[PDB]
Design a protein around this ligand. Structure first.
Ligand SMILES: Cn1cc(C(=O)Cc2ccccc2)cc1/C=C/C(=O)NO
Ligand SMILES: [K+]
Ligand SMILES: [K+]
Ligand SMILES: [Zn+2]
Ligand SMILES: [Zn+2]
Length: 366
């Protein structure tokens, strides 16, 4: 149809809530999307928990298995943990395996729907776990659903484009497809000394026949909706022309929005929204994902607003009373206001980058 597919299931939302770093976030988001009763304008779909075999299409058995053990326990001692990433920035708590599988399945489902012509846009705000390596958790990413969806997607579509708008660089997803030309990865993110993962400069382009098939736009603190769109809509224009994608997987981690603990970018869901609109306009099959977002209230407002955009709907400022109303204090409005920090993004260095890029995107043609 022309109607968007909204991957959802009360079981699933509960599952996602159990994640340490972002408790009750999944619920808060569905709850708010429901309060603006947008779900009514979408096609709900239950997540087909990823099979051991499906997850294994990108992750080593050794890893998936170890992730399983620990999940049915508590990583009792296991000094081998570090070998797989389980530690602090990826706590191997109990029953996370089911957690992973739940999410990875959802994203896979989303991709299935897109494949089966059931819709042009499939959503899974829980997904977006872009750091997970083929065999080693990373920055709260125990499973890389982002990649899985791309794989499942490549079944029907030839060239697939992955646009990562999370605050952090989408290393995991990028690596997975660093050596191929069938999948292109575009990532906007804060790049600085010490800032995790600290990978993906602009000189990062890919390897072998995957060279120039990995584009990275390093941004600096303070960037707002103004410049961000300029920068983004600029790159996405080139990428589109020189790549001609068949489908698109878009990660929209809200850890870039003003107010997020990450205190780096100074974006508001409206800006990210404009980027979303620009992509959607290509009317290719598109798989939407969540990801970072740690100022929960805000993360909810953001993704809800975006969901609105996806429906070409205009939401009212008044935050609809709902299960978490209290949380949107003290103004209870949808809009987010950019903090008052300077935008350390020198316009010279920027244009310098947008050329470096389009220049590399020149080869992609040739
Ligand atoms: C909150 N978080 C902490 C880490 C680290 O492991 C390390 C770190 C080290 C020095 C400065 C800042 C962060 C990674 C994340 C989030 C990733 C994310 O949301 N991906 O989508
Ligand atoms: K990113
Ligand atoms: K690539
Ligand atoms: Zn272990
Ligand atoms: Zn992030």
């Amino acid at each position: 149809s022309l109607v968007p597919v909204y991957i959802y299931s009360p079981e699933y939302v509960s599952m996602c809530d159990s994640l340490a770093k972002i408790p009750k976030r999944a619920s808060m988001v569905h709850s708010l999307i429901e309060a603006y009763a947008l779900h009514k304008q979408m096609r709900i779909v239950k997540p087909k928990v990823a099979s051991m075999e499906e997850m294994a299409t990108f992750h080593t058995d050794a890893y998936l298995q170890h992730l399983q053990k620990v999940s049915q326990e508590g990583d009792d001692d296991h000094p081998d943990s570090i070998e797989y990433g389980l530690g602090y920035d990826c706590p191997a708590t109990e029953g996370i395996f089911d957690y992973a599988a739940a999410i990875g399945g959802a994203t896979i489902t989303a991709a299935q729907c897109l494949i089966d012509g059931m819709c042009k846009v499939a959503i899974n705000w829980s997904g977006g776990w872009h750091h997970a390596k083929k065999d080693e958790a990373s920055g709260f990413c125990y499973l890389n659903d982002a990649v899985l969806g791309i794989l499942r997607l490549r079944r029907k579509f030839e060239r697939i484009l992955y646009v990562d708008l999370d605050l952090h660089h989408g290393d995991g997803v990028e690596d997975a497809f660093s050596f191929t030309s069938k999948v292109m990865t575009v990532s906007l993110h804060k790049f600085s000394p010490g800032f995790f993962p600290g990978t993906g400069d602009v000189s990062d382009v890919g390897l072998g026949k995957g060279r120039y098939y990995s584009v990275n736009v390093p941004i600096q603190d303070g960037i707002q909706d103004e410049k961000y769109y300029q920068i983004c809509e600029s790159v996405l224009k080139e990428v589109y022309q020189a790549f001609n994608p068949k489908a698109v997987v878009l990660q929209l981690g809200a850890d870039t929005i003003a107010g997020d603990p990450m205190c780096s970018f100074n974006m508001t869901p409206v800006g990210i929204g404009k980027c979303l609109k620009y992509i959607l306009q290509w009317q290719l099959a598109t798989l939407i994902l969540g990801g970072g977002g740690y100022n929960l209230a805000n993360t909810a407002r953001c993704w809800t607003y975006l969901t609105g955009v996806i429906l070409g709907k205009t939401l009212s400022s008044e935050i609809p009373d709902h299960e978490f109303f209290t949380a949107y204090g003290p103004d209870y409005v949808l809009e987010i206001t950019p903090s008052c920090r300077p935008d350390r993004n020198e316009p010279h260095r920027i244009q310098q980058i947008l050329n470096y890029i389009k220049g590399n995107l020149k080869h992609v043609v040739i």
